[model samples]
Target chain A: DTRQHLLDTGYRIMAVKGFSGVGLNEILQSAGVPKGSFYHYFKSKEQFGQALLEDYFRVYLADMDQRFSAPGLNARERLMSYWQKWLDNACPPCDEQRCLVVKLSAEVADLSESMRITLRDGSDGIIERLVGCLGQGRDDGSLAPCDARHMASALYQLWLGASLLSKLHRSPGPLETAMQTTRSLLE
Target chain B: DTRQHLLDTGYRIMAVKGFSGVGLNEILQSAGVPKGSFYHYFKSKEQFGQALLEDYFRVYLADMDQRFSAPGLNARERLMSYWQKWLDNACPPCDEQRCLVVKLSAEVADLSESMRITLRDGSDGIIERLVGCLGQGRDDGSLAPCDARHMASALYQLWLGASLLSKLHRSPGPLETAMQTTRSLLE
Candidate 1:
């Protein structure tokens, strides 16, 4: 539970402050876990950071499933629901619901191979799931016919970049633009 | 001279490693400046980072002017040339030539307000210049007619996100997709 606690605390802190800016002591202090116990759970800060990402994706993927597979919605409706949820959380006015992939992908991908692989694997999982959703939309005729994988990749990149710009300006204008572009692309 | 030297060193190091992953010692040693003397040149690491962002934008703006103003290229060609160059430099197998805005935008935006504004002001400059180029393309009928501001914002966001994904995947695939999408949009 201490490990989970530290991970939760690290997730909260790092999502806002970033991985390199926070240290073990801060995470431990925030989680009320002792340092020795932390090393017992994680080999190093890099490993702990790796665990944090894994933890995030575990929760994130399930949430995605719920949003996409919710009953009674057409596939287009389901996919658009997912996009709306993305905008609700990914941009701010508030980043409490921010995605760590958007936050840490660029920064950590270069520094740690283990972490980069985690990100690469995590993103692939996400894009593939998106492909499934888009394919469903096409099959159900609730969306335009197109290459689902390509559309997923492009939309994912758009939102990710928009999130970066959202953080940069601490404003939602870039994300709002991404939403319109997504609409256009989807059409 | 020492300040510019440190700024240059910091830019190269941070472009590869990022801001928080790197420290003043590595930069000082890389630049052959002593630890004690680094403070004399830069008040602190954060300030050094701020200076580095400013120094980066100064060089960046000048270079944008050069590319946009190149003779014998129409507005559309010049803009496409800029995007191609972004892919050329921003993605790896070599990030030493990477754009600092793409590399540092999200990482530093949250940690330091000064750097964030530097990023904010810096990105606005980029998008506006993009607007100028997009407008010119419209004027010469070199590009499809549309709201240049909206198109510039969307394209900039696309490329920005694509750059982030390029780092995540460690491949130019994302950027290559952006290029195709950009070409489609420009038409």
Candidate 2:
């Protein structure tokens, strides 16, 4: 329970302040876990970061599975719904949950190799599923025939960059552009 | 000058460690500037961060201007060459200069509103120039007629995200995919 508590607390703070920006005392104090207990749980800060990412992506992919599998929607609809959800969360006033991937991906990638791999794998997981849904879209005639893998990666990267721009401008303008691009590419 | 020295040192360290990950003491020590001199120059860490981004984008746009204005090349070729240079720099063994915008955009955007505004203006400057080139492509018949503004933003965002992924995986895989997609989208 303390491990989960620490992860949740870390997510909340790090989602805004970023990984290196926050220290162990703050996370431990916020989580109400003793410093000794944190060491007991995660041998080092990097290890904890890896676990945090592992947990985040696990939950993310689960939610993504549900969205893609929802009944009464074509694969294209399901895919667009996912981006719509992203656009909703990314608008203005950052949401802690939605900010993790964007916030940490650029910060931690070069700092720790292990954490970088976690990000690489998590990103792959997202794009791989997008590729799958794209396949279904083509099969069911909900989308045009295109390179599913390339399209998925491009779409993911576009949104990632758009999210960064959104943070910079504190506006949804880039996300809106990306949304339209997504539609043009997919349909 | 001590000012330029500090900025140069800050860029080299921050390019790999991020804005928050490195301390002023480290930057000052590396730059061979005293602690008192830092305050005299920057007033505060946040001010230093703003100046850093300001200087970074100023040089970046100037270089971009050169690339876009090269003689004997169509707008599309010049544009692709810009991305090709990105691919080369983003390949492996990080280049200190090219890493600033990607490295700091997400890290500092949420940390300071002043920094965020700096990033916003900087991003706009880049996109503004990109729109200029896209317009040239259309007028010169080097690129298909399309929404030049939207296409420029989409392309910039894609490359930004691809650079992040390239950092994560330490490979050019995502950049390569984005490069191919850029070609596909433009043509």
Candidate 3:
């Protein structure tokens, strides 16, 4: 339970401040855990990051599955809903925290091989989920006719890029424009 | 001369290590300047970052003008060439240094207001250049029909995100995929 708490707190802090931006001292302090206790749980920040990536994706995939499998929504609608959720979550009126993967992937990937592999695995998992959704959309004839896997990969890249732009600009306009182009691509 | 050297060296180091990853000591050491000299050149790292963004885009814009205004190429071809050059510079086979804007924007935007404004200005400058190219492409009848402004913004975002993914995966496939999708979007 304590370990899970530390991970949860770390996620929130890291999500807001980024991996490199925050230190273990701050995370442990916020989690109300002793400084020495960190090493007992994980070897180092890099190891903690690896585990964090896995934990984040586990929750993210479960949420995605639940959202995509909602009743009374076709595959196309489901997919659009997913993008809409992304936009909504990204532009939340609260504090404007963004997707951790989009924020840290570029900054950390080149700096650490282990973290880079973690990021790659996380992105691959996302692509797999997206490909599954696209396949369903194609079978249902709601989405445009195209290679589902190829389009999934393409669209995923587009959305990821769009999210980064939106965060950089601090506006949802980029994402809105991307959604329009996304619909156009489907046609 | 010393200030210019700091800025130039800062760019090269920041490009590879990101904004927060590298410390003042590292930058000063690499530039062959003393720690006290840094304050003489710039007030703080944040100020230096703002200047860096301005300087980067200044050079980048001039380069865009030269490329976009090249002889013997129509607007569509010129625009395609711009993307090609961006791919070459950003994901070079030998160095693969990556773009600082895409790498650092997400990490810094929320942390610093001034940095966010710098990012906003830099991005706006790039988008403006892209819009100009799109307008030319439309006039020459070489590109597909679309809103040049909207398309420019979307394309910039797409490339930014794709670059991040490329760095994360340590592969150029994401960029290649982006290039193919960009071609289709133009068609």
If ranked by lDDT, best first, what sequence of candidates would result? Answer: 2, 1, 3
DockQ for candidate 1, C-alpha atoms: 0.59
Supply fnat for every model shown: 0.57, 0.71, 0.66
**What tens-digit string does per-residue lDDT give for candidate 3 at A74-120?**
88888888888887777723333558778677566444677766677
Docking category for candidate 1?
medium
Cα lDDT tens digits, model 3, B42-141, are 8888788888877788788888999889999988888898889877766533233547677677675444677777777877888898899899888889
TM-score of 2: 0.90
Residue A122 displacement in candidate 3 (angstroms)? 1.3
Instruction: State each model's CA lDDT, in order.
Output: 0.79, 0.81, 0.77
Question: What are the clashing pairs of model 2?
Answer: none
Task: Name the lDDT value of residue B98 in candidate 2.
Answer: 59
Each model's backbone clash number: 0, 0, 0
Candidate 3: residue pairs that collide: none
- Model 1 chain A worst lDDT window (10 residues): A90-99
Instruction: Quote the chain B TM-score of every prediction.
Output: 0.87, 0.89, 0.87
